[PDB]
Enzyme design. Structure first.
Site, mmCIF file in Angstrom:
data_model
loop_
_atom_site.group_PDB
_atom_site.id
_atom_site.type_symbol
_atom_site.label_atom_id
_atom_site.label_comp_id
_atom_site.label_asym_id
_atom_site.label_seq_id
_atom_site.Cartn_x
_atom_site.Cartn_y
_atom_site.Cartn_z
ATOM 1 N N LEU A 16 0.807 -1.228 0.000
ATOM 2 C CA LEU A 16 0.000 0.000 0.000
ATOM 3 C C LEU A 16 0.840 1.278 0.000
ATOM 4 C CD1 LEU A 16 -2.677 -0.965 2.730
ATOM 5 C CD2 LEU A 16 -2.979 -1.240 0.267
ATOM 6 N N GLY A 17 1.940 1.276 0.753
ATOM 7 C CA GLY A 17 2.795 2.457 0.866
ATOM 8 C C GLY A 17 4.265 2.151 1.080
ATOM 9 N N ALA A 18 5.111 3.144 0.805
ATOM 10 C CA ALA A 18 6.551 3.041 1.039
ATOM 11 C C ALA A 18 6.968 3.947 2.204
ATOM 12 C CB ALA A 18 7.327 3.379 -0.233
ATOM 13 N N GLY A 19 8.054 4.696 2.025
ATOM 14 C CA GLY A 19 8.561 5.581 3.072
ATOM 15 C C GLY A 19 9.901 5.128 3.620
ATOM 16 N N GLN A 20 10.595 6.044 4.293
ATOM 17 C CA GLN A 20 11.932 5.778 4.836
ATOM 18 C C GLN A 20 11.922 4.775 5.993
ATOM 19 N N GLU A 23 7.279 -0.119 5.240
ATOM 20 C CA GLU A 23 6.170 -0.289 4.297
ATOM 21 C C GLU A 23 4.845 -0.568 5.007
ATOM 22 O OE1 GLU A 23 7.408 -3.463 1.636
ATOM 23 O OE2 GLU A 23 8.749 -2.130 0.527
ATOM 24 N N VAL A 24 3.740 -0.433 4.275
ATOM 25 C CA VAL A 24 2.418 -0.833 4.767
ATOM 26 C C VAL A 24 1.778 -1.801 3.770
ATOM 27 C CG1 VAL A 24 0.182 -0.065 5.679
ATOM 28 C CG2 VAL A 24 2.164 1.427 5.877
ATOM 29 N N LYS A 38 1.967 -2.912 9.187
ATOM 30 C CA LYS A 38 3.000 -1.885 9.092
ATOM 31 C C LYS A 38 4.365 -2.534 9.287
ATOM 32 C CE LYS A 38 2.246 2.504 10.517
ATOM 33 N NZ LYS A 38 2.051 3.602 11.512
ATOM 34 N N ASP A 130 -0.575 14.945 15.963
ATOM 35 C CA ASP A 130 -0.391 14.724 14.533
ATOM 36 C C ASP A 130 -1.745 14.580 13.825
ATOM 37 O OD1 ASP A 130 0.912 14.343 12.141
ATOM 38 O OD2 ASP A 130 2.000 12.542 12.787
HETATM 39 N N1 LIG Z 1 -5.077 0.506 8.487
HETATM 40 C C1 LIG Z 1 -4.854 0.849 7.193
HETATM 41 N N2 LIG Z 1 -5.672 0.400 6.212
HETATM 42 C C2 LIG Z 1 -5.470 0.731 4.918
HETATM 43 N N3 LIG Z 1 -4.458 1.521 4.494
HETATM 44 C C3 LIG Z 1 -3.556 2.046 5.369
HETATM 45 C C4 LIG Z 1 -3.713 1.728 6.802
HETATM 46 N N4 LIG Z 1 -2.712 2.362 7.441
HETATM 47 C C5 LIG Z 1 -1.983 3.021 6.506
HETATM 48 N N5 LIG Z 1 -2.480 2.842 5.267
HETATM 49 C C6 LIG Z 1 -1.921 3.422 4.008
HETATM 50 O O1 LIG Z 1 -0.485 3.362 3.999
HETATM 51 C C7 LIG Z 1 0.111 4.650 3.790
HETATM 52 C C8 LIG Z 1 1.021 5.026 4.961
HETATM 53 O O2 LIG Z 1 0.294 5.003 6.195
HETATM 54 P P1 LIG Z 1 0.777 5.776 7.532
HETATM 55 O O3 LIG Z 1 0.134 5.116 8.730
HETATM 56 O O4 LIG Z 1 0.577 7.259 7.312
HETATM 57 O O5 LIG Z 1 2.357 5.450 7.602
HETATM 58 P P2 LIG Z 1 3.447 6.526 8.109
HETATM 59 O O6 LIG Z 1 4.791 5.996 7.671
HETATM 60 O O7 LIG Z 1 3.216 6.710 9.592
HETATM 61 N N6 LIG Z 1 3.120 8.059 7.306
HETATM 62 P P3 LIG Z 1 3.569 8.424 5.642
HETATM 63 O O8 LIG Z 1 5.031 8.053 5.557
HETATM 64 O O9 LIG Z 1 3.311 9.906 5.504
HETATM 65 O O10 LIG Z 1 2.675 7.592 4.751
HETATM 66 C C9 LIG Z 1 -1.025 5.647 3.602
HETATM 67 O O11 LIG Z 1 -0.984 6.167 2.268
HETATM 68 C C10 LIG Z 1 -2.315 4.884 3.862
HETATM 69 O O12 LIG Z 1 -3.227 5.029 2.772
#
Ligand SMILES: Nc1ncnc2c1ncn2[C@@H]1O[C@H](COP(=O)(O)OP(=O)(O)NP(=O)(O)O)[C@@H](O)[C@H]1O
Length: 257
Positions: A16-20, A23-24, A38, A130
């Protein structure tokens, strides 16, 4: 604790996502239950710092807050397992083709739902720090839940406060209280009513904290009713003490109609 589960009892399906910091992933806890995973990129964050968010959630359990289900901490790739929210963050949702079609009634609903989740957090004597649309998640039934308790404390490694969402007394004096979260909520209302627009369009962070020290507030935005703008202007009062409680916002928003 009794929050640990074996790695084998979860299957990760779609990224679903990346980042430093990792991943998610969408996944399943032993096949039966849909979950979000996460993932910590080893070496980036501390393992203790990464799990502080989970530790926090063990205490914060309410319907308008994404629930923690379990963790995997025994082996190198550490997981945080939470309830799956089908429509993603509120920010992304609002900007999608589907979200662009959601009218003002349901926007006030979203808004009142978050005020409800926040009212639990203040009742529990916590601060989030936040609070913004990217940190609110949306279920299939279009329910909003508060997510991302990485900065939440009981009143930091990695971690950046959201300048454009942070109250002036929090920026200038480091004074984070539930009232500063009320400030943030006001900006989150701006995000909702504008379908995910960035706060202070065309203004750098530095412009903003300078502008606020001069008493700048965002002017009434197009397609925002007097009454809803008065709710924002209430959250953006200079003196923190003079900003309303979340219990009040959830009341005033809910009867908006
Ligand atoms: N419980 C969840 N269900 C579905 N999608 C999620 C969930 N938690 C996070 N995501 C997705 O994964 C991405 C990152 O989530 P997030 O909890 O913001 O991680 P983060 O590293 O704390 N912040 P960021 O690095 O700004 O994305 C987002 O674009 C969300 O759409």
């Amino acid at each position: 604790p009794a929050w640990e589960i074996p790695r084998e009892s979860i299957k990760l399906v779609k990224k679903l996502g990346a980042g430093q910091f990792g991943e998610v992933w969408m996944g399943y806890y032993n096949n039966s239950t849909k979950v979000a995973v996460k993932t910590l990129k080893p070496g980036t964050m501390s393992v203790q710092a990464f799990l502080e968010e989970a530790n926090l959630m063990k205490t914060l359990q309410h319907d308008k807050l994404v629930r923690l289900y379990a963790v995997v901490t025994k082996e190198e790739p550490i997981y945080i397992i939470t309830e799956f929210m089908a429509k993603g963050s509120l920010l992304d949702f609002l900007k999608s083709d589907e979200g662009g079609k959601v009218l003002l009634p349901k926007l006030i609903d979203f808004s009142a739902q978050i005020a409800e989740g926040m009212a639990y957090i203040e009742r529990k004597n916590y601060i989030h720090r936040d609070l913004r649309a990217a940190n609110v998640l949306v279920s299939e039934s279009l329910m909003c839940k508060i997510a991302d308790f990485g900065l939440a404390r009981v009143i930091r490694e990695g971690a950046k406060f959201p300048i454009k969402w942070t109250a002036p007394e929090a920026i200038n004096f480091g004074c984070f209280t539930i009232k500063s979260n009320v400030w943030s909520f006001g900006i989150l209302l701006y995000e909702i009513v504008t379908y995910g627009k960035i706060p202070y369009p065309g203004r750098t962070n530095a412009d903003v904290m300078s502008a606020l020290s001069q008493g700048y507030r965002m002017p009434r935005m197009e397609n925002c009713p007097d009454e809803l703008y008065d709710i924002m202007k209430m959250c953006w009062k200079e003196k923190a003490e003079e900003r309303p409680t979340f219990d009040y916002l959830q009341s005033v928003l809910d009867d908006f109609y």
